Amino acid sequence: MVRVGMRAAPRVSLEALKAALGGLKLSEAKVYLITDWQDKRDQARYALLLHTGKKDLLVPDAFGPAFPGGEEALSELVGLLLAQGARRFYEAVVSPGEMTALLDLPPEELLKRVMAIANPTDPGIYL
Amino acid sequence: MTLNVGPQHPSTHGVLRLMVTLSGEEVLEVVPHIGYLHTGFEKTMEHRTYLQNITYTPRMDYLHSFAHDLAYALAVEKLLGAVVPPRAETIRVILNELSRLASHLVFLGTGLLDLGALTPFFYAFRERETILDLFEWVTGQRFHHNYIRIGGVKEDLPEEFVPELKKLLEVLPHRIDEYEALFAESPIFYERARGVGVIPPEVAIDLGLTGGSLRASGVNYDVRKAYPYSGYETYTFDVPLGERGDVFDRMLVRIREMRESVKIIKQALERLEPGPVRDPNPQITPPPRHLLETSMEAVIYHFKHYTEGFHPPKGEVYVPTESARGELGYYIVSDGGSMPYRVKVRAPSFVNLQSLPYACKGEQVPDMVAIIASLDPVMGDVDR
Amino acid sequence: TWSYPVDPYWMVALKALLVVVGLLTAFAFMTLIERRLLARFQVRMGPNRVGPFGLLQPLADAIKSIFKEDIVVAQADRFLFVLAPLISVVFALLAFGLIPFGPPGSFFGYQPWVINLDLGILYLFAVSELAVYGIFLSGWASGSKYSLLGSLRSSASLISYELGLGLALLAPVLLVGSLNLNDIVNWQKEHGWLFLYAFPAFLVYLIASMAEAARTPFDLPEAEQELVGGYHTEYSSIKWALFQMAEYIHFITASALIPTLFLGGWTMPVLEVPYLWMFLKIAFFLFFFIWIRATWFRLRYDQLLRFGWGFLFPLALLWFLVTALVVALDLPRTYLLYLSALSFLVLLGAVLY
Amino acid sequence: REGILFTTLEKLVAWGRSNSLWPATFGLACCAIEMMASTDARNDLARFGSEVFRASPRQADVMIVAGRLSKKMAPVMRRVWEQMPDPKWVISMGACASSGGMFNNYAIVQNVDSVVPVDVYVPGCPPRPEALIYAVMQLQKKVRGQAYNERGERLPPVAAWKRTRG
Amino acid sequence: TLKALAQSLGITLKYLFSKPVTVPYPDAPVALKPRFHGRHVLTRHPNGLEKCIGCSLCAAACPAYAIYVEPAENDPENPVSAGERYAKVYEINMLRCIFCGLCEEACPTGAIVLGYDFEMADYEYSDLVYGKEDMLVDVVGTKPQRREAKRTGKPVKVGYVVPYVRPELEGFKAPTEGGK
Amino acid sequence: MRLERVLEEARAKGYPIEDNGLGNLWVVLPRERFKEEMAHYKAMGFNFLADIVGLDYLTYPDPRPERFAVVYELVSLPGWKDGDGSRFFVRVYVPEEDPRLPTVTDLWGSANFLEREVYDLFGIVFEGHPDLRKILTPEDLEGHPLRKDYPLGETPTLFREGRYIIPAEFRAALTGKDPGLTFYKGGSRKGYRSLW
Ligand code: SF4
Ligand code: SF4
C-alpha cells in the first residue's frame, strides 16, 4: 500500500494524487473517504483510501472545508474519481483520535478496518 | 423469461429478490436472493450484556417477538440454573399467545391484500390494535417490548390489563368466526388457492419446511405438545391440521389456531393466582429498587449488575420453542464472561424458504405472490 | 335521429366542451367519493382534512401533478411515449354525448345530448376497442417489457370481454328496431325498462364492463402485487394522471350506459324529470361497483379469460338467438318477459344451496 | 417550473404539494410495519392527502425510508430514489434509519443521509404512528417554508434540490 | 360457494353503517397508557434538588450507547443533587436511543425516567441530541413544539392525554383523563 | 428409542459423548467418518435436518482441537409414520487451514441454505454442494464475518460539542478472556451456576 500526500495540505495532496493516479482505471476500485462527525460536513476533514483490488493508495486527512481550499480539493478529487469511472464511494466514520494512528497501522489491518466501517455514500455530497 | 422481480418491487412483501425463470403464465423456477435485511445479530450480540440482549431479541421476528424473548430467556435460565415463578410463567404464555394472534392477524391481512381484495385487512388490524393497546398497557411499548427477564418478567401487571383482556377475549370468538365465514367458504379464493401450493410432506421434510405450513399438509408435529416447555403440558389443547397443504388449508388451519389460542388464553386467565414475579437470586435479578437507599450489598449488586452484569457457567445450550412461524431456538456458547461467546439463531423463516422454488413450481404468475404470502415469510427472520 | 332536431354547430361545440370539463370535475370528485366510500366500508373515515369534505384535496393533487417533472424516459420511444396518453384519454372522453339526459329541448331550449347518431352501439363498440388500443400501446412505448406483459394481460382480458359486449348488446336491437339511444329510450318508455325483457344480456353486459378495469378481474393488471400492469410505471407528472383519468371516465361511462341501455335511461315511469334520474342511476351503479371494488378478489385473468370466453359470450349469443327466434316469429312480447323472469329465478335459486 | 417565480403562484403550488404529499414507502424492517399501522382504522395517514399509495417510484414525491437500511440495500434504495420525479422529499423513519441505532456494525448504514438526501428525521423504535404524522406535518410546513432549525435558519422546501446528483 | 360473495357484501355493508371507529390526531389527543416510553425527564426531589447524582449507570446500561454523562461535584452553597455528585452534562442522542428504559432501570436516584411526549420529529440530526435542560420536568413540550410555539407565539399543546402520570414522574405535569 | 441406539453405536466405535446436566446431547464424529456416519444416521430414520451452525473457537478461554467447529442438528418427526421424537447434535471440528466438510444437501435439502450461510459467515467450504454462493453478506463483502478474526465494525456515537463515545472502550461488561477492571476476576465473575 502506498501513502501519498501529507495532512492539512489540501492542494499538495491533491496534486500528488493527480500525479500518482495516472491512467489507472477505477471501474472496479472502491473509494473510501475517511472522516469524523457524520452530520457536520462544514468543518469536516477527509482522508482517502483507494482500494483498487490489486493495490491500495492512502492519502492522509488533508481534504475538506476544515482546511483552506480543502473543500474545493475534495470536490475536484471526487469529480476526478467519478470521471475515471469510479462508482463505489464509501464514507468511513472514525474517531478524531483514531484518524491519525489509523493511517499508521499496517496496510492489511487499516484496509480491513476501513472496509468494515465504510458506508455506501452518494459522491454528490462531496461535489 | 428470466424475469427479475426486484427487492420491494413490485409489492413483494418482505423485501426479496427473485429471478423467476419462467416462460408464459406458469412458474418454472424462482431463484431466490436474500440478504437485504442482514443486520448481524449473531455478531453484535457477542458484544452486549445478557441483560442488554433482551433489547435485541424482539427485533428480528418483529411480529411474533415474544417468542424470541421466551426462547432466549429459557436458554439462559437453563444455562445458569434459574427458577421461574408460576405466575410469571402464566404471564409469559399469555403474552406469547397474544403476540401469536397479532402475528397471525398481520400474516392473513398481508396475504389477502397481496392477492385478493383489500377490505379484510382492516378488521384484522383493528383486533391487532386492541392487542397493541394491551401491550402498551402492560409494557409501555407496542412491540420490541423489553419486558421479559432472565429471572422472569420486568415488573407486575397493572389493574386495567385483566378487564381489557376479558373484553378482547369476549369479542374475539365472534371476530375469528367472521373471518372464517368470509374465507373458508371461499367464492374465488377457493378456485385461486385450493390447487396451488403443492406441499408433499416428504419434500417438506427433506427441505425442512417445519413452519406451520407443514401441518396444512397433514403432519402432526407441534412443539407445544411434543416438547412442552412453558407449562403448555398443563393446558387443554387442540392442534389444527390440514388435509393437503395448499393456501386454503394453510389459512384455515391458522384461523382455527387463533380460536384455540383464544381458548388457551381464557384457560390461563382462569388458572391465575397472585404471587411473586421473578427469581430472587441477586446474581440473576437486580436488587429491589426500594432498598437501594439502605443496603451496601444492594448498592454494590445494583451497580455491578447494571454495569458488568453476571457470568453464566462455561458451556453450550439450546432450547426449542414453537412460534407462529415454526421451530425457533438459540444455540448459545457461553465462556463464563458477562457477554455471550456466541449466539446462533435457528431461523424458521430461513429454513422454510428452501421450499419456495418447489412450492411455487409450476404455479401461476399472479399466484406466485399469493403462494409467497401464504407461506408467511418474515425477512427480519430470514436475513437476520 | 328520426324525430330529434339538431343544434347549431357552435352549440354542439359548446355542449361538447361542457361535457368534457364536466367529466373532468366528475372523475375528480368521484375519486373523492370512492376514497371516502371505501373508507366507510372499512370502518375508518375519509379525508376530513384539506377539505372540509376533502373537496380541495383534488385541487392540491392537480397542483402537484403539474410542476411534477414530467419525465421522458430514455430508451423509450420519444414520440409514442408522449402520444399514447392522449389517445387513451380522448377515446375514453368521447362517446358520452350520445346518452340522452332528457327529452329534446330539455337542455334549457336545445338538446340534452350532444349527438344522437342513428347507429349508436356501433359507435360505442368502436370507441371501446380504442381504450384497449391505448393500453397495450403505452405498454409497448414504456420500453419496459415488465409493463408490456401487464399491458398484454390487459389487452387480452379487455378484448375478450369487449367482444362479449357485442353479443350482449345484440338482444335489445331486435326489440327496439333502431340503433339510436333516444329511440331505445322511448321504447323503454312505451313497453318499459328493456332489462325486464333482456336480464341475461343485462348480466353479461355488466360482467363484461367489469373487465374494462372496473374490477374483479383485478388482474387488469395494476402494477401492484402482480406482474405489473401496462400503460403505467414510466409516467410521472401529467401523463399518468391522464391514464387514470381515462380509466375512471370509462368506468363512469359504463356505469351510465348500463341504465341508459338496459334499464330506464332517464325516462322514469313517474315524474319524468330529465337529468336527475339518470344521474341517480349512475350513482347507484357507481356505489354498487365500489362495493365490488372493496368486497371481491382477483381472478388471475386466466380464470377471468376462461370465464368470459367459455361462459359469458356463449350465454350472450344463446340469448341473442332466442330473442331472434321470438322477434322473427313475433308471437307475443310477453314470452320474453316470462323467459327473463324465469331465467332470473333459475340463476338465483342455484346460489342458496 | 419547480413552483417558483411568482409570490402567489409558489405559495399556491407549495400548498398543493404539501397537502398532496404522495408517500412511497421503502419498507425495510419493523419500522415498516409501524408505518403500516399509520394507515389502519385508528390513526390513518389517509386524511391530509396521503390516501392513495402507488408502489411505483415514478409517481410519488415523498420517499419514506422505514427500517434498517442494510448496505446491500443501499444501491437499490439509491436507484429507487434517483428514479423518482424531481420535486421529491425524503423522510428517515426510526433509529436504524436516522443513525446506526442499537445495531452499530458492518451490516447497517449509520446514516441514511449518506445515500439519499434526507428531508425529515423521526426518532423512535419504532416511532409512534402519531410521531410519523408529526413528521409529515413537519415536512408539510417545511415545503410551506414554515420550518426552522434550532439555530434560527429557515429550511429549504426540497432537500435533494441541493446536491450535485452527477 | 356462491353464497359467500353475497355474505361478504352484506357484512361489508354492516360495517359501512358502523361509522365511529377512529381517533383524529392531532385534533383528538391520543390516549396513551401510563407506562408509555416517551421523552426522557430528569426528576427533582421535593426540596427542588435534582435526583440525578450523575452515576452514569443509565449510560452503562445503554445498549445503543446513547447517553453521555459528565459528572461534577455539588456546590454546598447552591446544591443541585442530593449527594456530592450531580449531572454536569446529561446528553442523550434520540437518534441513537432505542427507547429501552434501561437507563431509568439503572437510575438509582430516579432522575432519568421515560416520559409521555412523542412529537419529537425534527429536521436535523444534530438537533435530535437532547440535553439536560431539554428534559427537566419543568419543560412542557418537545424541541420542535417549543420552537414552533416561540416562532408562533401560540402555546404548546401536547397531542396526548393519559389517565394519570406515574409516581416516578413526580413533578411531570400532563393532561390527565379530564382532571383539568 | 432411536437415540439409545445412537449412543450405543457411538460409544462402541470410540466416539466421544458430551453431555450437560440440562438435557442436551452431542456426538462428535471425526472428519473422515462424518459423511458416512451421518448418511447412516439419515438411514436410521432421521427425517428432519434442523440446523447447520458454525463456531469459531479462536477467542475461547479454553483451547479446542480446531479453530472452527460445525454442528448439525438431526431430528425424527414424532407425528409422522413412526415418530419416536429423538433429536441430537453432531459436532465436527474443522482445521483453520482446511475449511472443508462434505455436504448433506444430497441427504436433506435443508442443508442447502444452511451450509451456504456457514460458508458465508466462516470460510468453511462445503464439498458436494449444488451451489455455494454467498447468501447474506453483501456481494462485494470481503472475508467471512463470524470468525473472530473479523471486526464487528462499530461507528462512534455522537453528541453536541466534541463529546463522543467509543463502545469498545465504553463497555463495562467483560468477556471470558477479559481480565476485568480489578486485578483479577474470581468467583461469580469467573463463572457462576446456582443449584436449582
Ligand atoms: S428503529 Fe427499531 S423499529 Fe425501526 S427498524 Fe430499527 S429495530 Fe425496527
Ligand atoms: S432507553 Fe435509550 S438511553 Fe436508555 S438505555 Fe435504552 S437506548 Fe440507552
Ligand code: SF4
Ligand atoms: S442512573 Fe439516574 S442518578 Fe444515575 S446518572 Fe443516570 S439519571 Fe442520574
